[PDB]
Amino acid sequence: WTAPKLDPNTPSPIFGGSTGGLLRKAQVEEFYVLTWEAKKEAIFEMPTGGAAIMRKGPNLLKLARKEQCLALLNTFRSKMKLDGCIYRVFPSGEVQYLHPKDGVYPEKVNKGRVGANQNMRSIGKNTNPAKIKFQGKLGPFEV
Amino acid sequence: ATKFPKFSQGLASDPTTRRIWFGIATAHDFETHDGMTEEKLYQKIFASHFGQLAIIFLWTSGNLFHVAWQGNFEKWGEDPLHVRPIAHTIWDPHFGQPAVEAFTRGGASAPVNIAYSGVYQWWYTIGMRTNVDLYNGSLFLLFVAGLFLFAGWLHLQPTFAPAVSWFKNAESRLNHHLSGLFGVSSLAWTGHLVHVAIPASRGETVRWDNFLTTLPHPAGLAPFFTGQWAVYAQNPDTAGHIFGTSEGAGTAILTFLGGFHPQTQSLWLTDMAHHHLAIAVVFIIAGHQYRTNFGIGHSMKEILEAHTAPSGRLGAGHTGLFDTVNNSLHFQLGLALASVGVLCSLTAQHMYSMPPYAFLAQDFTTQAALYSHHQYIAGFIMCGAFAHGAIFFIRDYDPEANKGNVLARMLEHKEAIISHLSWVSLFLGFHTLGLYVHNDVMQAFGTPEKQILIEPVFAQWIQAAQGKALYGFDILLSGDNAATAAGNSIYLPGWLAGINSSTNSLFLPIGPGDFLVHHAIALGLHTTTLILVKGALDARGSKLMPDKKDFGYSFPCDGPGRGGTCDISAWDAFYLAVFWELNTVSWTVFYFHWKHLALWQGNSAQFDESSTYIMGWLRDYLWLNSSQLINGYNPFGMNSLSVWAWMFLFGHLIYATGFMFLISWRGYWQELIETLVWAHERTPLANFVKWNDKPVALSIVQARLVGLTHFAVGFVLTYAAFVIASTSGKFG
Amino acid sequence: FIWAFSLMFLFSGRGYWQELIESIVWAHNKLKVAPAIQPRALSITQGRAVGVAHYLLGGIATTWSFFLARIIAVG
Amino acid sequence: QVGPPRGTMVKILRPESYWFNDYGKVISVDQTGVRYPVVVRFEKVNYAGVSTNNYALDEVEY
Amino acid sequence: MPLSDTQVFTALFVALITGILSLRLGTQLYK
Amino acid sequence: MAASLLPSIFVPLVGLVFPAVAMASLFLYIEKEQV
Amino acid sequence: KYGDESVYFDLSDVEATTGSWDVYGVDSASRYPEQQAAFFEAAAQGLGRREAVYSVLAVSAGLLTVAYGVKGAKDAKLPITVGPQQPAQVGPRDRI
Amino acid sequence: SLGTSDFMVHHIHAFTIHVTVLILLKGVLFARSSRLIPDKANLGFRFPCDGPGRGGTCQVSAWDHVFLGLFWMYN
Amino acid sequence: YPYLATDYGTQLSLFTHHMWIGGFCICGAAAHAAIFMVRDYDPATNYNNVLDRVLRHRDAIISHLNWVCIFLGFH
Amino acid sequence: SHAVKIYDTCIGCTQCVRACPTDVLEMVPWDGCKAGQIASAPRTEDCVGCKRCEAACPTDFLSVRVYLGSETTRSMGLAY
């Protein structure tokens, strides 16, 4: 995984339209793009609602939330055993490689990942909130 | 980001309508504010106390001004038993001509509201007679409120702002509050009663103009400083004394007659002056207990430190609790709320039975309204006390510092406490409900003689000890022994006259219905205490969620995992206990109201017959006394109870709307709002207008609170409308 | 009564009841009465199910008793 | 080999554990110097439905 | 005897001053 | 004279005017951007 | 390109990708008569400023409430302004 | 006969029917997914929630819609 | 039935009974519609049919129904 | 956003990671457990707070914990 995969203009799945697609948030704030390689043409379920047909080869799909993209990708991986990546696209026009964020699915341990938000202690060894009183602390968990 | 959560960045950056709601909600939670030091916390609390004290005094001044300006205080004073007090004029543009013609009561020439707060009887008893006196009082309290607002402003400036250690000075604060806030205040009130209220009760008006010229006693201060203090009790008021006149008026200013003034059915004003004097002496003495700046007095830390049981049954005793109480604002708040709620209950339970205000016992609607008021306030204050103690256990409790003291011991045997609370609650509810259902069935089956009617002989035996001669135990004051002989020198003739009279409510006769309802009350108190103590002791963690102290006082849940953790927080324990508190207080005030209504119609047999089974309460109390209330307005016009009918139905509405927030939960509503967002975004001519904050459903805790608030508001308003309308329809 | 009793299941949540069960289970374990089948609070779905079931039962049976008593007595 | 032998009943000392102050059979103890090597099996399930978890050497007693 | 109009308006002006002072206290609290 | 005048002015003042200004003002502040 | 077959993503055509479309708007510069436009420009000459509108509405609120409490309520013949003009009634226990 | 009270009560009936239909049809249509939870089909027909996240996801399952739906039906 | 209308009690009872049965059965119909939708619904066999298009504008249906519901209640 | 913390009782079973619907959690190499891997939460900004990780964590008490904090758009799970 030398570099993240770039985002081309690949064909989108066949869909008749729905009212569950992108709202104004895509225009003002952000929206997410899911791209996957399909082994064969098949009918999948849109996370917004309705049924769509994915095209053989690469597909591109823009969705409102990362959760929708990841739910659909997890469906593709667990049922159809496909591979896919997610991008975040801002209104300024800069995309952002999101899934898996390493080139390796997070459930598989991969070298080079650095532990973030790890407390090297058990849950009961957290101090009491009275000891961190009047301190800029989120809670006992962040000390 | 926005400016409204000035105290919360995390809410300022929130892009949804939850920002507004949580900035409203967390406004007064100063301890969780960004960049909040202890010094700023204490200074802001001090100035907020100044602020709402000024609010209290403005409320009192407003009551006085409205009674002076729009009320009928003089005329009411002329005929207290045949004049309905006036609260304030109504200027409602929505009134129709029948409403304007039906709300004109008293001698008003405009629509008015009939003051059911007892302020008329109170102000008449304290010597106020004319609208000018009430106006002067209102203006003075306006000045006092302005003074306290200026004091809050001044002590917020850096020169005058006090440090944390000034607040932490416990000894000086308690010395000054006991001696001066309590003691000297009681002395000054005694001086008022002796100089103004008693002379006004005996006919002569003593205002500031003739103050300093009319001696309150025929002898001056010679009996005082020569130690002949019994001269001030030489000639009390005659039994045939008319309040506010000189017929049968004595000269004694301080005495301990006891009982009630026969014409007003209220406490003798000389008794209440002597009472406040004795309190003043006791509290001025008490306020020299602690050591501040003069090398004498106790140290509270060392008092607690030296009280450790030698056998170790209590563990390390109270060692380490001084700093716990003093550094914990939530511990202090829970203690203050606990005490204040107990006091409010005591006021409810003592004002009905021992009315301190002239012509208050004869005005039944005011008595009922005051009892309901103070009991509901007390129940809420109690719920707050326990909630703040749970908050103390989360935020302010230090297990390392409190190691071995009674508090850590409470944590150690919390399961025993909760389990025995559950046992007593289960026993009380099983047996009380079973006896009520049994009595329901026996009445239903036409054999009321087979009811389990347990005579409450213990309470009756107390009453016999206290002078009641109905039951015939005749042990302590009803019998002839040393206790009664000692009592029969000063107080006991008046007390026995009061307690053995059928008219007053000093110690009402007790029956099996009173047994069953007091056990229902005990059920309610034990269950509410179960919920609240469970919340407080499991606040810091339980087996379902060991690390509950890391999530704060109020959080929604810990997810559906581990079986489900809905309503797991101590805040949620409070939220659940408020229902039981409302239920218990309603039981108590239903008992009060029905027993007193039976007394006031003169047929106490109705309650004594129908209070043993639930259908009797549903029929002869709720259904029976709701007739005139629901007929406040109807197709055949309306009367003066139409407002209370509307409020009755209003409270029903709020109660039901609360049920919506309590039963339906967030996630149905979130999806519904999502569809609504789509609709508004895709509607022509409406997409021109766009929300600044993203509309979202109410959060879980927020909606639990909103539903609880609606539940409680509808509860209180419905019952207030009922207790006032029924009592005024039957008695005015 | 059954309608008001349903309000218990409706207005509350599983976490509280589970902790109360923990205290009661402590009391049972104190006397060696601990059941082999571990006591558990109702599931959240079951709590809602019980709440709606008792609510419907109490409301409908109240209306049933009211209607039948009224219409039988008046005739 | 360190820690309790396999098959012995160990009293749990972790305060947050569901089986705190309860007894469970030792299944295995990891000798590779891991933080929680002691695998303890429990007759009764927790709220998550599991019957086992890992403990340190000072979180068990036999 | 009803309150004189001068009495009502004097008390109302005192109230207006009290309200000004309440605003000063509120602003000071908000800092 | 106070009794015949002041209610008819202050009831709309406190129940229509002051609410309107207060709600508008609070709205303008709450929606006011942080910067 | 956004216009390609089965392509609806374009970092150059961000507006079409995100759906920010003017559905019914029209950019025609003039629809009204010019002098009518001039009249209504002059009729709202000072009110085009938001704070001028704030002053207008504050003054209007004060004048409407004063006039309603002095003259408007009486003119509308509200029952509240009309006196009770009926004999009074006494509550139970002969309490007026 | 059918006077104004009959008009009002019949429009009430229609209101209450339409709300019950709202709840039930929302549960059926959003049984598999929503903008809040897209992966709701695999959570099952009868689950309590998806967690306190997303602001709180209580009573999202179509079963919970039948719960509220049942309530309004009763009403 | 003979002497049914004259017996007001049985007539009221039958009306109320069958109303409650009807409302319950409708709520169950919604529940089993949702159960089918979660469990037995296959997007492959429902591509552009009458059900899939309902699922593709459920937002419009629910928003219009909710609007209708609000309107009806308010009025 | 919310706060997600991983504690050293983690056995590296990956169930928290597989349960996460927003890809907040990932497995990293770690010598502390037998499996040789601990979870981590780099993309904490994407945590909606659904607490599926806590539901899927077998260790008693949980090795992954989610503490609800400041609510953002992503945390609120809004498509608008």
Ligand code: CLA
């Ligand atoms: C908190 C005490 C209090 C309360 C509850 C009331 C209640 C009422 N007053 Mg009274 N009033 C009060 C104090 C109070 N007043 C005081 C101290 C004065 C000055 C002497 C007045 C002078 C006054 C007049 C002259 C008139 C009323 C009128 C009214 C009625 C409604 C119109 C109105 O609100 O105008 C109130 C008018 C004001 C100018 C505001 C006065 C309020 C005080 C000074 C401040 C109270 C603020 C409060 C503590 C904190 C608010 C913050 C937040 C909780 C909202 C209503 C019965 C009118 C009436 O009878 O209509 C039928 C009427 O004509 N009031």
Ligand code: CLA
């Ligand atoms: C003689 C000295 C003195 C006096 C009078 C007071 C008085 C007061 N202090 Mg204290 N204080 C003092 C010295 C004193 N202080 C010292 C030396 C310090 C430094 C250590 C402080 C530090 C201090 C702090 C830190 C705070 C106060 C506060 C207060 C106010 C509390 C409100 C109150 O009175 O509730 C009303 C209470 C009573 C009148 C006594 C209660 C009696 C019971 C509950 C009721 C009995 C009532 C009775 C039966 C009649 C009721 C019915 C009748 C109305 C019909 C009060 C005005 C608080 C504040 O900020 O307010 C501005 C506060 O936060 N004080």
Ligand code: CLA
């Ligand atoms: C002297 C008394 C006192 C004091 C100083 C405090 C102070 C505090 N409490 Mg405590 N509390 C009290 C009494 C008190 N409370 C009582 C009596 C109760 C029981 C009801 C509670 C219950 C309680 C809970 C459960 C919690 C607090 C919390 C807090 C803190 C923050 C309050 C907040 O969130 O913002 C201010 C609160 C609000 C703006 C909400 C008020 C909403 C009300 C209920 C609406 C009422 C509607 C109205 C009456 C209807 C009008 C009539 C209708 C006809 C229209 C603060 C330390 C919270 C906290 O974080 O503690 C650290 C917390 O979780 N308290």
Ligand code: CLA
């Ligand atoms: C009328 C309504 C009602 C009733 C009866 C109860 C009853 C109870 N609540 Mg609940 N509760 C309610 C409303 C109600 N609550 C509401 C609306 C709230 C707000 C959410 C609460 C909140 C609440 C909390 C938070 C707590 C309670 C607790 C309790 C118990 C208190 C102990 C007691 O009285 O035991 C006596 C028990 C009863 C009266 C229950 C009914 C038992 C019946 C009579 C026996 C039936 C036998 C008969 C053969 C049945 C036939 C059925 C057949 C078809 C199978 C009890 C089980 C506390 C608890 O668990 O304490 C241990 C507790 O912690 N409740």
Ligand code: CLA
């Ligand atoms: C839609 C019908 C309707 C409306 C609009 C009103 C309106 C009014 N009535 Mg009428 N009334 C009605 C129906 C109605 N009534 C009916 C059916 C009855 C039964 C016959 C009555 C019986 C009646 C009586 C007996 C009296 C009134 C009075 C009043 C006035 C209250 C004075 C005021 O504004 O105080 C200011 C408003 C309040 C104090 C309300 C506070 C409530 C809020 C929600 C509390 C929480 C506040 C919170 C902090 C948020 C604030 C936001 C704020 C910034 C905007 C007002 C003109 C009173 C009056 O004229 O006295 C002057 C009076 O005494 N009415």
Ligand code: CLA
């Ligand atoms: C609590 C304060 C309060 C007060 C003082 C009023 C006052 C009034 N309301 Mg009510 N109202 C209130 C609260 C209040 N409302 C609330 C909270 C609600 C929601 C439930 C309502 C709902 C309501 C309805 C639905 C209606 C009224 C109507 C009226 C008007 C009756 C006049 C009349 O007989 O028709 C004669 C009417 C006229 C001659 C026209 C008068 C037009 C002027 C411009 C009004 C002046 C009012 C005010 C002083 C200035 C603006 C204040 C503020 C916006 C800045 C009167 C001005 C009725 C009406 O006709 O009002 C438009 C009516 O239909 N109100």
Ligand code: CLA
């Ligand atoms: C009496 C109690 C009550 C009330 C008023 C409501 C009201 C509502 N519910 Mg709730 N609900 C309740 C109890 C209640 N529910 C209970 C106990 C349950 C069981 C859990 C539910 C379950 C529930 C669900 C599951 C759903 C609803 C829905 C609705 C809405 C239906 C639309 C409607 O009524 O038109 C509009 C609202 C009303 C008519 C409410 C009364 C308002 C009156 C007319 C006042 C009008 C304005 C007034 C003058 C105030 C302005 C002045 C003021 C500022 C002073 C509405 C918000 C549905 C919904 O939201 O979709 C539409 C829905 O899906 N509710």
Ligand SMILES: CC1=C(/C=C/C(C)=C/C=C/C(C)=C/C=C/C=C(C)/C=C/C=C(C)/C=C/C2=C(C)CCCC2(C)C)C(C)(C)CCC1
């Ligand atoms: C949670 C918590 C809290 C709170 C708590 C509470 C709220 C409690 C309450 C409590 C209470 C509320 C109590 C009460 C009590 C009472 C008492 C204790 C009483 C007594 C009495 C007596 C002793 C009497 C005697 C007598 C008689 C019998 C009669 C006559 C006279 C004489 C005197 C002889 C705190 C903060 C603290 C801490 C933390 C936690």
Ligand SMILES: CC1=C(/C=C/C(C)=C/C=C/C(C)=C/C=C/C=C(C)/C=C/C=C(C)/C=C/C2=C(C)CCCC2(C)C)C(C)(C)CCC1
């Ligand atoms: C011109 C004129 C007029 C009018 C007048 C007026 C308008 C007056 C007024 C006056 C006023 C208008 C007064 C007021 C007062 C007020 C007050 C006195 C208030 C107070 C408040 C408070 C005290 C509060 C506090 C607080 C809060 C609650 C919040 C925050 C915190 C604090 C604490 C700050 C008329 C038309 C009639 C006639 C002609 C002439």
Ligand SMILES: CC1=C(C/C=C(\C)CCC[C@H](C)CCC[C@H](C)CCCC(C)C)C(=O)c2ccccc2C1=O
């Ligand atoms: C009805 C309802 C909603 C929908 C309610 C919406 C989101 C809020 C409605 C607010 C509007 C703006 C009307 C508010 C009317 C109030 C009288 C205004 C109070 C404002 C104060 C700040 C003064 C929920 O989001 C919810 C969530 C969890 C459990 C139960 C429920 C629930 O029952």
Ligand SMILES: CC1=C(C/C=C(\C)CCC[C@H](C)CCC[C@H](C)CCCC(C)C)C(=O)c2ccccc2C1=O
């Ligand atoms: C009361 C209550 C409980 C507690 C109820 C307990 C767990 C179960 C109810 C008691 C039954 C009766 C226990 C079964 C008893 C055995 C069958 C024993 C034989 C009976 C002999 C006594 C005769 C919840 O678990 C709950 C969960 C979610 C929302 C609301 C609630 C809720 O309101």
Ligand code: SF4
């Ligand atoms: S509250 Fe709703 S969401 Fe949070 S746990 Fe209980 S059920 Fe699941």
Ligand code: SF4
């Ligand atoms: S956190 Fe719980 S689930 Fe995620 S890996 Fe560590 S142990 Fe397995």
Ligand code: SF4
């Ligand atoms: S909460 Fe939901 S999102 Fe945040 S980590 Fe746990 S699972 Fe992934």
